[PDB]
Amino acid sequence: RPANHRQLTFEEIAKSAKITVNEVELLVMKALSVGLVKGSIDEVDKRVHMTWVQPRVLDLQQIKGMKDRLEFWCTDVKSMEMLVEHQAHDILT
Amino acid sequence: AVQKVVVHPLVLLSVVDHFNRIGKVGNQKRVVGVLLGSWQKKVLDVSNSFAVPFDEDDKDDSVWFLDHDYLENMYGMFKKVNARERIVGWYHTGPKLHKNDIAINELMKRYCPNSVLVIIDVKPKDLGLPTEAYISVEEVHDDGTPTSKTFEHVTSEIGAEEAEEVGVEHLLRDIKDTTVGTLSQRITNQVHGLKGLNSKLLDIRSYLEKVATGKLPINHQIIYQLQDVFNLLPDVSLQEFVKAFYLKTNDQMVVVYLASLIRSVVALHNLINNKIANRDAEKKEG
Amino acid sequence: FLDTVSTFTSYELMDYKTFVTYTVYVSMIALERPDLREKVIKGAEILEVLHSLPAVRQYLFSLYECRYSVFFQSLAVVEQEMKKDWLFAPHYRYYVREMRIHAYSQLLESYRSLTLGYMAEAFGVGVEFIDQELSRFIAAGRLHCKIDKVNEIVETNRPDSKNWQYQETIKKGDLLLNRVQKLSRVINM
Amino acid sequence: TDYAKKRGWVLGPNNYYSFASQQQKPEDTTIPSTELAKQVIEYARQLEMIV
Amino acid sequence: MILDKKFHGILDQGEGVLIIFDEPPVDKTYEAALETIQNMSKVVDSLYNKAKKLT
Amino acid sequence: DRLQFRQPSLKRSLMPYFLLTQAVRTGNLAKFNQVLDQFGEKFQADGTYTLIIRLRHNVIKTGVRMISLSYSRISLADIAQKLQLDSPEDAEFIVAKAIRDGVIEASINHEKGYVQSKEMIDIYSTREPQLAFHQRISFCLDIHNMSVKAMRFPPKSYNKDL
Amino acid sequence: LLKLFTTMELMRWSTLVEDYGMELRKGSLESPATDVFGSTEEGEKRWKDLKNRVVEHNIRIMAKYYTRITMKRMAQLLDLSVDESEAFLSNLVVNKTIFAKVDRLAGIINFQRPKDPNNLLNDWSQKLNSLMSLVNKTTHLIAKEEMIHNLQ
């Protein structure tokens, strides 16, 4: 999930790793000890917030989604350029 | 080794001379010029340069023609008149990087020290910076491919030290200086979206083309860092930055009070002289 | 009254003890704690003239000490002495209210939330009176933000620094806006 | 009866429940930033139009 | 000592909650308010010159 | 009232109206109702007594608005007897008639029979400020900017003849 | 030594109890362990201040990470009383713990979430993030644009 409430909880980690709730702190502590993730969570109730990570193998749905979000960003920057520059060039030049 | 380079416009105007002394023959190929500079300091500073007759073949790309006697004679006389500058590398005017450039650059890798490569455009229609410093160093690849010559992009800047700024400013008489204020700021704030629009739009089309229609590995490993950094800004909800909008908008309020109050101070002399001058000139006119 | 070092017994207008007795009201009420600590507490003049009457020392150390249990029991002497004076009587209504709101702002300054127990024991008065006191000092007094009684506890917020410190100039912005509208009224006539 | 077909609300255990009360989510601050940019365009316009 | 403003803090009786905060940008509202107060005399004096020259 | 203007005309004009315009905030129904018609000659002889006949029953609305500026919890004897209205039905009924106006903010809750209210009158400080004074910045810059036009055009009307 | 080098994972010292016991038992190497425990009080100070020193050092390591380890649960996993953890905080007030946040109601502590001035902190983070995306986006874009030239 690249966007749409990146914030998560330990229930998916413990459910996918069939581990108890007492070992998830050592699990994320080892995850931060390896150095592949820099995630620091300011949570009060148990939550899992993550940061920069590298796939390093492949992702085709992220290639197509990369084209979708990339084209969306490009047409939004183009829309703002034509919008601001449209009347801005006519009134200021 | 080298973090940044400095390229003076004199060598690019010498490329304008490369496009001037052609003679209307119909070749206009990638004429290779002998780039000169100061490799002593960590930063590279190009002062001037010269050229060497360079001709390739139509079909075979591996054909390249250089000269050692002309290089040692022009470099010998140039060193005799100015010994503060020595050979550093070369540069070609072709917009495309051919395979033969490893053999062309390899000669100045053997005889000369590590040469930097600069790719420019034959037509000054590109809005981007025409100069790109490409260092000729061999890098180890993680996929296991054999070690080969790799052209890493080194940042470059176009600056003049003492006289070329004066000569360019006198020859142009159209360009403007920094001139902080309304016009120089609003022009950048208007055309900047096109300055990024032509670059990104010009790049992601051939990029997306080479995604599906690509082979001959293009170093797909760096694409993971590409999309990674692109996904390092996952549409922040702006919740924490609201107070920052209150700070920048409070500075906006400060500019409001400064504009209204200061302009209200400027209205004094106008809104006084408009009366005391008109009524006295009128009552004393006749 | 800062030149009281050179003052002397002037039988023409007012005695020295009457000058001190008259300036102890404007100094005791019209000044805050830093102003008293800088002017009178640091100065030796009130340290010399406090030995004449022991009451003034009580009205200074009890007010500076924030002890309302003795200040309200002894405040009746300030009430009766405040009136029946030539020039100081018709202003007796302003000193009382101004001193009460000044003490309420003094105690309420360093206190964000306040229960009715510590307040009633501190001031030594019933809650039924401070109810209408603060009720009248929210709108009439205009000392701090709105007060709530959902938990029967005096709880204020006072956001008067961060945004209101910048919002102190909006009054001069609106009055200056009407004044530059007057500047537009001067145009052509 | 008439208000159950007119208001169209939920009927609880002998109590009237109130929904959609102060439940609106605040803005993303993106659109007001765009209209602030348009206001800046109008500030360069009106501040520098006659020049 | 909070009334003496030696440090940042505030007490509490009902809940006993301690809060520490500060306001660094003090030099903004001072200079702004001084510019408003000083410019009030400018606009008022302008209205005195124009009110004098007109009526 | 009259604070910044010193002239002996609005004073004499306001002398008959001063007692009642000061009696508005205290809001005593039975006494001030007789005080109005007692010496009322000109302000009630002005014609049709429309806004004063609206004021005779607006006293309780300004008083209950002062209650909205007062504490939250409403008692059945202390504040109801204080407001000269001692009954359970019309208390919450008329207070609710003050809530339906929209000028105040209250939280209608019934747990044990008492009517509570949140009465949050906290200003927009650190509560959506950009949307709060956004129109303030736009409008103030529009008025000050047309004032900039009002300091640009009169100089043209100055240099027009020379 | 490798466990005490860096990135100290929160482990139980009971595994080190038998390690130190056999460290006193075996005489092939590091023999003068009984000489370390020669004095009746010096060895006890070295041991109590040793376990104290590592139980403070691991706190100094996990203090860099903002993961909010919830020391109330950590006191349960460590199987120790909260009173000597308050004494550990008495070692932190002299260990420069001034950059922290405590709670009156709960017992969870916060080593982060300051007042966060937007002109310094969010300014810095937005500078490094935006600028890093700009120049990092700048490098591999034209670099790959030069990598695709060799396909012709």
Side-chain angles (χ1 to χ4, degrees), chain C residues 65-128:
Chain C
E65 199 176 1
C66 194
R67 287 185 181 272
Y68 294 98
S69 296
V70 67
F71 175 74
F72 287 165
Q73 183 66 41
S74 65
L75 190 57
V77 180
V78 180
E79 177 65 28
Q80 294 179 356
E81 189 178 1
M82 187 177 288
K83 64 182 180 180
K84 297 185 291 294
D85 198 357
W86 178 257
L87 195 62
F88 197 73
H91 295 285
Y92 79 104
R93 292 296 299 271
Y94 180 72
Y95 288 98
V96 172
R97 186 194 69 189
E98 184 68 28
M99 197 175 188
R100 293 294 295 272
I101 192 170
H102 183 74
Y104 291 162
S105 66
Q106 179 180 0
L107 186 140
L108 194 61
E109 181 68 28
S110 176
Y111 288 157
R112 190 182 68 250
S113 179
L114 285 167
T115 186
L116 295 175
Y118 183 75
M119 184 179 288
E121 291 292 327
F123 290 100
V125 77
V127 185
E128 69 272 15

Side-chain angles (χ1 to χ4, degrees), chain B residues 33-46:
Chain B
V34 178
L35 184 64
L36 300 170
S38 178
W39 190 254
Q40 183 178 2
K41 199 181 286 185
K42 187 183 286 185
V43 64
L44 194 146
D45 187 75
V46 170

Side-chain angles (χ1 to χ4, degrees), chain A:
Chain A
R1 298 290 298 274
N4 298 115
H5 188 72
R6 173 84 76 189
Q7 185 66 254
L8 293 173
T9 188
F10 287 98
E11 293 179 353
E12 186 68 28
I13 297 171
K15 182 176 73 175
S16 296
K18 64 184 288 184
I19 202 66
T20 188
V21 193
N22 291 318
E23 294 292 328
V24 300
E25 292 86 4
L26 277 75
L27 192 143
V28 300
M29 184 180 288
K30 183 67 181 294
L32 294 174
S33 296
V34 174
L36 55 92
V37 66
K38 295 179 182 179
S40 66
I41 317 100
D42 201 359
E43 87 280 24
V44 176
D45 189 74
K46 53 181 178 67
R47 291 180 186 271
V48 177
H49 182 74
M50 288 290 109
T51 56
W52 174 71
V53 75
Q54 185 177 3
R56 191 64 177 85
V57 42
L58 189 63
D59 271 326
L60 55 94
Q61 63 183 357
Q62 297 295 321
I63 287 169
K64 293 180 176 66
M66 181 182 71
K67 297 186 287 184
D68 185 74
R69 180 66 66 192
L70 187 65
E71 193 272 332
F72 187 67
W73 197 279
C74 182
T75 192
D76 284 329
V77 173
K78 185 185 287 185
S79 69
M80 294 299 291
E81 189 270 331
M82 293 177 70
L83 191 144
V84 175
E85 193 267 334
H86 184 273
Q87 63 266 13
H89 182 74
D90 291 332
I91 67 173
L92 296 170
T93 305

Side-chain angles (χ1 to χ4, degrees), chain A residues 52-53 56-57 62 73 88, chain B residues 142 190 200 221 224 227-228:
Chain A
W52 174 71
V53 75
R56 191 64 177 85
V57 42
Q62 297 295 321
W73 197 279
Chain B
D142 199 3
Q190 281 179 357
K200 181 180 178 181
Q221 179 64 43
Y224 299 103
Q227 190 180 1
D228 198 359

Side-chain angles (χ1 to χ4, degrees), chain B residues 242-243 245-251 253-254 257, chain C residues 157-171, chain E residues 21-25 28-29 32, chain F residues 122-134 136-137:
Chain B
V242 173
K243 186 67 172 65
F245 280 161
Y246 171 74
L247 192 144
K248 183 66 166 61
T249 311
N250 195 1
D251 291 330
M253 180 66 76
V254 174
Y257 289 163
Chain C
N157 195 1
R158 198 254 186 188
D160 290 332
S161 296
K162 298 293 187 291
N163 197 1
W164 183 257
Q165 189 175 1
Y166 287 95
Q167 288 177 358
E168 286 180 353
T169 62
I170 198 166
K171 293 182 183 293
Chain E
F21 61 94
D22 54 354
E23 195 267 334
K28 297 295 289 183
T29 64
Chain F
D122 187 74
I123 58 174
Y124 59 91
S125 296
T126 67
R127 184 68 178 172
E128 295 293 327
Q130 300 87 18
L131 194 142
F133 58 85
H134 182 273
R136 174 64 180 171
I137 293 175

Side-chain angles (χ1 to χ4, degrees), chain G residues 11-150:
Chain G
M11 66 183 291
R12 178 65 67 192
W13 297 271
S14 296
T15 62
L16 277 76
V17 171
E18 69 258 8
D19 290 332
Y20 193 71
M22 69 181 72
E23 192 270 330
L24 268 71
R25 287 181 177 91
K26 68 180 181 291
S28 179
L29 52 94
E30 60 193 357
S31 295
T34 62
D35 290 331
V36 173
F37 276 171
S39 296
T40 182
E41 295 293 327
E42 183 68 28
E44 293 179 353
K45 292 296 290 183
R46 295 175 187 175
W47 183 253
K48 179 70 175 177
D49 191 75
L50 192 144
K51 295 294 183 182
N52 194 2
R53 188 174 179 87
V54 296
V55 85
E56 293 172 358
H57 183 69
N58 60 5
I59 298 298
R60 296 297 297 162
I61 293 172
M62 70 181 72
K64 181 175 72 68
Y65 295 101
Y66 304 155
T67 188
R68 292 293 186 267
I69 201 167
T70 64
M71 72 171 288
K72 293 295 289 183
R73 185 69 60 84
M74 181 183 70
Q76 184 178 2
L77 269 71
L78 289 174
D79 293 331
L80 50 86
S81 179
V82 298
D83 292 331
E84 60 186 359
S85 294
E86 296 175 355
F88 290 162
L89 194 145
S90 296
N91 297 115
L92 260 67
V93 67
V94 298
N95 203 1
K96 275 78 176 175
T97 190
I98 62 171
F99 186 74
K101 179 72 174 66
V102 295
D103 290 330
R104 183 188 177 97
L105 193 145
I108 305 299
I109 53 97
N110 298 320
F111 287 163
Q112 201 56 38
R113 191 82 264 277
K115 301 177 180 67
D116 284 331
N118 292 314
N119 54 4
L120 296 175
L121 193 142
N122 287 318
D123 192 1
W124 183 69
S125 296
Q126 192 67 41
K127 279 291 295 299
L128 270 70
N129 193 1
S130 296
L131 270 71
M132 184 177 177
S133 179
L134 287 170
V135 296
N136 196 358
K137 180 179 71 68
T138 308
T139 55
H140 55 72
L141 184 61
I142 58 174
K144 182 181 182 293
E145 195 271 332
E146 290 294 329
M147 291 296 173
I148 64 170
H149 287 170
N150 297 115

